[PDB]
Structure formats: structure tokens, C-alpha cells
Amino acid sequence: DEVWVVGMGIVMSLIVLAIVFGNVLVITAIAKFERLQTVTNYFITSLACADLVMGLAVVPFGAAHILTKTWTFGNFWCEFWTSIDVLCVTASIETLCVIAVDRYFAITSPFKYQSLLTKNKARVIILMVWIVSGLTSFLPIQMHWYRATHQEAINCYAEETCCDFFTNQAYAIASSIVSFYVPLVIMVFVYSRVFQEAKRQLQKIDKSEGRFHVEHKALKTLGIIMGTFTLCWLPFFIVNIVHVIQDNLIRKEVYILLNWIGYVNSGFNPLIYCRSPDFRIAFQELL
Numbered sequence: 355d356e357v358w359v360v361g362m363g364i365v366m367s368l369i370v371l372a373i374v375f376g377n378v379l380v381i382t383a384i385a386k387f388e389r390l391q392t393v394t395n396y397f398i399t400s401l402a403c404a405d406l407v408m409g410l411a412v413v414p415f416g417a418a419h420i421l422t423k424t425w426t427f428g429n430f431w432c433e434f435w436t437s438i439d440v441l442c443v444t445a446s447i448e449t450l451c452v453i454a455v456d457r458y459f460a461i462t463s464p465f466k467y468q469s470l471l472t473k474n475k476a477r478v479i480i481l482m483v484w485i486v487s488g489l490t491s492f493l494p495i496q497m498h499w500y501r502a503t504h505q506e507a508i509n510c511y512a513e514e515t516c517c518d519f520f521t522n523q524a525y526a527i528a529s530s531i532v533s534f535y536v537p538l539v540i541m542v543f544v545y546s547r548v549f550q551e552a553k554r555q556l557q558k559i560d561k562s563e564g565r566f567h568v569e570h571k572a573l574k575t576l577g578i579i580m581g582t583f584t585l586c587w588l589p590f591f592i593v594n595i596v597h598v599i600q601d602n603l604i605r606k607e608v609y610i611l612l613n614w615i616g617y618v619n620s621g622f623n624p625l626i627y628c629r630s631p632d633f634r635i636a637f638q639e640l641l
């Protein structure tokens with residue numbers, strides 16, 4: 355009466371369904387209606403594209419790998435799958451930073467905002483983000499610049515039915531730095547400044563109209579924005595650093611679980627970044 359195959363399969367299918375449904379809905383809502391076509395919504399389009407590619411490509415095959423315990427395809431497909439996984443992850447995480455910086459420049463520089471950011475510059479920014487994402491993903495993995503040296507790694511690399519992730523110290527550290535830490539620092543600085551500006555505005559209003567009845571909301575919005583990202587992706591990169599720093603500190607199952615915890619963050623992005631009333635009207639019209 356085992357339920358391992360049935361129990362995990364249902365949840366794994368449900369995650370794919372949720373990700374694909376949400377991202378397709380967001381993409382078609384932005385594309386079909388001319389009201390929602392805005393410079394800010396291009397970054398949302400890029401993030402939705404990255405998460406949709408993730409949900410269609412990396413999750414279904416990882417599900418088969420976990421359920422079956424063998425890689426029925428060749429080594430070339432294993433390398434391609436690893437490359438596309440890294441590409442999608444880094445592209446999404448960097449697009450989040452781009453959105454944060456966009457909001458920073460919108461709020462802290464109101465008079466000059468319409469000047470420095472034009473619809474032409476957004477295309478260049480998105481192209482640069484995707485190119486940088488592709489440089490760290492396909493170039494090192496496809497040229498065997500990330501491979502390990504120990505006997506277990508060699509045996510895994512020399513077998514067609516095994517597909518496991520083995521990496522050396524330099525690639526792991528560089529990939530973690532490029533993918534996670536710099537965007538995290540930039541987002542922290544940006545959102546701290548935004549919170550300061552909001553508090554200053556509230557204090558300004560209070561002095562002017564305090565007598566008549568005329569920061570919970572800002573704290574709630576910043577918490578919803580930051581806590582989910584931190585909880586989803588912070589645990590994984592710490593163990594990513596440790597497992598090459600320390601040989602036998604961390605088991606493989608913990609690594610896989612913490613990797614899969616970060617995958618579900620793609621299904622939450624429509625809930626966080628697409629709650630605008632215009633988006634709700636568009637969703638009502640489509641469905």
C-alpha cells in the first residue's frame with residue numbers, strides 16, 4: 355500500500371499546472387490589452403517568460419528523475435537540462451532586481467523619471483540581463499569547465515543512465531555570487547530607501563493635517579515582496595557554498611529538497627506582482 359509514486363506525483367503535477375496557468379494568463383493578459391502595455395510591464399513580461407520556461411522545461415523532467423531514480427535519456431540531454439535550469443533561475447532572479455531598481459528610480463527621482471527611462475532602454479536592459487544570464491549558464495557547463503575531479507564524479511560522468519550535479523569550488527562560488535548575492539544587496543538598499551521616503555511622506559502629511567482625522571501598509575507590502583524571495587532562495591545558496599566548502603556536512607536529499615523549495619517561487623510571482631486593479635479587470639474580461 356505504498357503511496358510514494360502516487361503521493362508525490364499529484365503534488366508535482368499540481369505545481370506544474372499552477373505555474374503554467376498563472377504565467378500563461380499573465381502573458382496573454384499583457385499582450386491582448388493595449389491598456390497594460392507599459393515600460394514597467396516589460397520586466398514583468400520577461401520574468402513571466404523565464405518562469406514559464408522553467409515550469410515547462412525543468413520541473414517535469416526533474417519529477418521523472420525523482421520518481422524513476424534513473425535518467426532514461428542521454429548525457430547530452432542531462433547537460434542541456436542543467437544548463438537551462440541555471441539559465442532560467444539566474445534570469446528570473448536578476449529580473450526581480452531590475453524591477454526593484456525601476457521602482458527606486460520611479461520614487462526617488464520623480465521629475466526626471468520620464469526622461470532617463472524610455473521604452474527603448476528597457477529592451478536593451480532586458481537583452482543585457484538575458485545575455486549575462488546565458489553567459490554563466492551555457493558557456494561553462496557546455497564546455498566542461500564546472501566538472502569535479504573525485505572518483506564518484508568521474509563514475510557519474512562516465513555513465514549514460516546517471517545524471518547528478520557535481521561541481522568544483524570556483525564555479526559554485528562564482529555562480530552563487532552572480533545569481534543571488536549582488537541582487538539581494540541591491541534590493542535591500544533600494545527597498546530601505548523606498549521605505550525611508552514613504553515614512554517621510556507620511557510624517558509630512560501628519561504635520562499638515564494632523565488635527566483633522568483625515569506605516570502598516572508599507573511594511574506589509576515590503577514584507578510580502580521580500581520575505582517570500584528570501585525564504586524561497588536563501589536556504590539553497592548557503593548549502594550550495596557549504597557542500598563544496600565542507601565535504602560531508604550535507605546530504606544529497608537535503609540539497610534536492612532545498613533546490614525544489616526555490617522552484618515553487620515561480621508560481622507565486624503572479625500573486626505578488628500582478629494584483630493591480632487593471633490586471634484584475636483584464637483577468638475578469640479574459641476568463
Ligand SMILES: CN[C@@H]1CCc2c(ccc(O)c2O)[C@H]1O
Binds near residue numbers: 440444519613
Ligand atoms: C542542478 N541545480 C542547480 C545547481 C546550481 C545552481 C542552480 C541555480 C542557480 C545557480 O547559480 C546555480 O549555481 C541550481 O538550479
